[PDB]
């Protein structure tokens, strides 16, 4: 959780081809979700560090914003019908951790399972806590 | 035996060059591939990162325009051909 | 699932306690100490032990 | 009410069986993974102590 909140900084770099972040299995899973969503070009696992190769488009980076929801000092959980309202009318990615793995808010909404909201990527200005 | 279309590739060559290759286990390297016809083009690996970085105009040009843009990375191979004076005998 | 060593304290007990004993282990430890680290036989035996146990190449 | 209760009893029994089986499978997977991890760690530590 601390490692993910740290990796936010490494992900929000600009004018950089690649940036390093602390290693953790949770970081690896979030990176898997990001690559499946096509937000990073890739990443590499090197011992204590992970090297994220970032993706750009027309100069600007693909990742334009990261909003942290669940911090190590405060969990945030949502029922399906609260997640629907909170993610209403937004194309951003809200990362959710559930008993079924680290998935997207859209997978969580289709599954109707209760989840923990970790991060919001390219969510514009949409947050509640 | 050859598989995965290797027989087709060999048979699509001029004369019995493919048969000779498959039977004698002859090794052809470099521009020999271009002159035999196995490989169409001669492009350096340095283009692949270049293509990754510059493929954003494929969506600014039309499909045919993008297809022609791909050809900027084709180079001119050396004229040397190992089997130049052996195709007739083969 | 079959795991253990010594006969009374298994490998899961050897891992947990630093005072646990194992005569088979101490035989090799004593041989290494009585021959010397630089001994070619000792070096060969230690390399063989690491490889056979399958813990070589660990980082 | 008897008819509805028969239906509800069937539903509850099926739900209970499903949940029990899947939780058992998850626990088996976790136990197998952790056991293999400890199995390799123990041999590694024993070699280091040797």
């Amino acid at each position: 959780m601390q490692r993910a909140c740290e990796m936010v900084v490494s992900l929000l770099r600009v004018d950089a081809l690649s940036q390093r972040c602390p290693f953790h299995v949770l970081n690896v899973q979030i990176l898997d979700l990001l690559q499946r969503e096509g937000l990073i070009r890739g990443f590499k696992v090197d011992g204590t560090k992970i090297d994220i190769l970032l993706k750009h488009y027309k100069g600007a980076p693909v990742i334009r914003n990261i909003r942290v929801v669940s911090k190590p000092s405060r969990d945030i959980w949502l029922t399906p019908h609260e997640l629907k309202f909170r993610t209403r009318f937004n194309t951003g990615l809200w990362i959710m951790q559930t008993s079924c793995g680290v998935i997207s808010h859209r997978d969580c909404l289709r599954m109707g399972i209760g989840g923990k909201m970790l991060m919001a990527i390219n969510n514009g200005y949409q947050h509640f806590c | 035996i050859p598989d995965s279309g290797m027989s087709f590739v060999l048979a699509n060559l001029r004369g019995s060059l493919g048969v000779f290759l498959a039977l004698t286990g002859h090794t052809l390297s470099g521009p020999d591939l271009i002159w035999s016809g196995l490989c169409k083009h001669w492009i350096s690996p340095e283009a692949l990162p270049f293509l990754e970085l510059t493929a954003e105009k494929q969506l600014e040009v039309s499909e045919r325009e993008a297809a022609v843009l791909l050809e900027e990375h084709f180079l001119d191979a050396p004229d040397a051909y190992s089997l130049d004076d052996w195709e007739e005998v083969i | 699932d079959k795991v253990g060593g010594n006969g009374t304290e298994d490998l899961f007990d050897q891992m947990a306690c630093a005072r646990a004993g194992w005569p088979a282990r101490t035989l090799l430890m004593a041989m290494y100490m009585a021959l010397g680290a630089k001994h070619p036989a000792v070096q060969r035996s230690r390399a063989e032990l690491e490889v056979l146990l399958g813990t070589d190449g660990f980082v | 009410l008897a008819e509805v209760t028969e239906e509800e009893r069937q539903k509850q029994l099926q739900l209970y069986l499903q949940e029990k089986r899947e939780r058992r499978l998850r626990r088996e997977e976790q136990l197998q993974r952790i056991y293999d991890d400890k199995k390799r760690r123990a041999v590694l530590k024993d070699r280091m102590r040797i």
């Binding site: 090197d46 | 350096s44 | 190449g57 | -």
Partner: peptide, 30 residues
């Protein structure tokens, strides 16, 4: 923590050695 297993470049290099030459860029003068 020193007995954990995490993929590493040292591990990859050791595996390859059990089984890296740098190259200069070409000039394309012609």
């Amino acid at each position: 923590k020193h007995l954990d297993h995490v993929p590493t470049e040292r591990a990859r290099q050791l595996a390859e050695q059990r089984s890296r030459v740098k190259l200069e860029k070409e000039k394309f003068l012609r």
